[PDB]
Enzyme design. Sequence first.
Site, short mmCIF file in Angstrom:
data_model
loop_
_atom_site.label_atom_id
_atom_site.label_comp_id
_atom_site.label_asym_id
_atom_site.label_seq_id
_atom_site.Cartn_x
_atom_site.Cartn_y
_atom_site.Cartn_z
N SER A 42 0.81 -1.21 0.00
CA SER A 42 0.00 0.00 0.00
C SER A 42 0.87 1.30 0.00
CB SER A 42 -1.12 -0.07 1.07
OG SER A 42 -1.83 -1.38 1.13
N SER A 100 -5.87 3.54 3.43
CA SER A 100 -5.25 2.58 2.55
C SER A 100 -6.28 1.81 1.72
CB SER A 100 -4.42 1.61 3.39
OG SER A 100 -3.34 1.19 2.65
N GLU A 140 -4.28 -3.15 -7.47
CA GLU A 140 -4.88 -3.96 -6.38
C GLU A 140 -5.89 -4.98 -6.90
OE1 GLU A 140 -3.70 -3.70 -3.56
OE2 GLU A 140 -3.57 -1.68 -2.74
N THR A 209 1.59 3.41 5.41
CA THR A 209 1.88 2.00 5.70
C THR A 209 1.64 1.12 4.49
OG1 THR A 209 -0.44 1.68 6.46
CG2 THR A 209 1.23 2.16 8.17
N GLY A 210 2.14 -0.10 4.58
CA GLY A 210 1.70 -1.14 3.67
C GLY A 210 1.82 -2.50 4.32
N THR A 211 1.07 -3.46 3.79
CA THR A 211 0.96 -4.80 4.34
C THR A 211 0.64 -5.76 3.14
OG1 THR A 211 0.25 -4.04 6.59
CG2 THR A 211 -0.36 -6.30 6.01
C1 LIG Z 1 -1.86 -2.16 1.49
O1 LIG Z 1 -0.69 -2.55 1.66
N1 LIG Z 1 -2.96 -2.89 1.63
C2 LIG Z 1 -4.33 -2.33 1.45
C3 LIG Z 1 -5.01 -2.40 2.80
N2 LIG Z 1 -4.57 -1.34 3.74
O2 LIG Z 1 -2.80 -0.97 4.06
S1 LIG Z 1 -2.22 -1.18 5.46
O3 LIG Z 1 -2.39 -2.68 5.74
O4 LIG Z 1 -0.76 -0.92 5.60
O5 LIG Z 1 -2.99 -0.39 6.51
C4 LIG Z 1 -4.89 -3.82 3.47
C5 LIG Z 1 -3.48 -4.45 3.44
C6 LIG Z 1 -2.81 -4.28 2.07
C7 LIG Z 1 -3.29 -5.11 1.04
N3 LIG Z 1 -3.16 -6.43 1.29
O6 LIG Z 1 -3.71 -4.62 -0.04
#
Ligand SMILES: *C(=O)N1C[C@H](NOS(=O)(=O)O)CC[C@H]1C(N)=O
EC number: 3.5.2.6
Length: 265
Positions: A42, A100, A140, A209-211
């Site tokens: 993200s 996000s 995405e 952030t990202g995850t």
């Molecule tokens: C981004 O990395 N994403 C979109 C969403 N929100 O980001 S966060 O997790 O850093 O808050 C969920 C996680 C992730 C994704 N898997 O797309």
Amino acid sequence: DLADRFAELERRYDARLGVYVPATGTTAAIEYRADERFAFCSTFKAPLVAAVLHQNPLTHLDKLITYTSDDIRSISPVAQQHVQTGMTIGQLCDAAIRYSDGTAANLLLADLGGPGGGTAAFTGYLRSLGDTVSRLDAEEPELNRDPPGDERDTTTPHAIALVLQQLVLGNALPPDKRALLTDWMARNTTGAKRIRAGFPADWKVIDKTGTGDYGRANDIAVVWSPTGVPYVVAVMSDRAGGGYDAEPREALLAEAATCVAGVLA
Ligand SMILES: *C(=O)N1C[C@H](NOS(=O)(=O)O)CC[C@H]1C(N)=O
């Protein structure tokens, strides 16, 4: 030594860790695996918004964007609600950064336009800022899923930190656009347990952030000391050792930030 501390963290969390803080007046760059590639996840959403701001008049923010059911295909806490009404570009930027939202991101990609649903124009926006390393290839949800080591949809702690520095602290954007980006990042709702948890309360932190899968967890911030001196902090990690379903570990980023805060203080 910082490198010894970063390595212990890697062992503790069975993880791969990257850290970058560019040099300033009086502080040398902090670097650890700073030129290894990590998935964006993200985190591309911060320079995506800059790209959109940069490309258009401010009042483009008021343009209403419409979308439907089949446009919701990833975590989208805000866009899921307004599929009836549509959302303005400004609202989409807001959600993409503070929440996000992935649907906000895909739609901003399309607004930017061109091949790859806007992923080529995103990457060329980064080129225009001197970043020859980062690449975005998919939107995405596909962008968080590439196997570990795969170069698609990656940046480096070093590269994204220089991007973010230009965006928030240099002159990549005009001041009125700069302040909009800066303020959305300030009001981010997802980073409390990351870079933010590593710095004392009297430091200002703004972040994105990202995850992802494979235990991916990232945080890119600009922080300001109590006397107003800024630093750019990029922390990225993954845990390929767990496989696709490895849990991301926020505490890892919060521990690495604390290590960085003790150096910068
Ligand atoms: C981004 O990395 N994403 C979109 C969403 N929100 O980001 S966060 O997790 O850093 O808050 C969920 C996680 C992730 C994704 N898997 O797309």
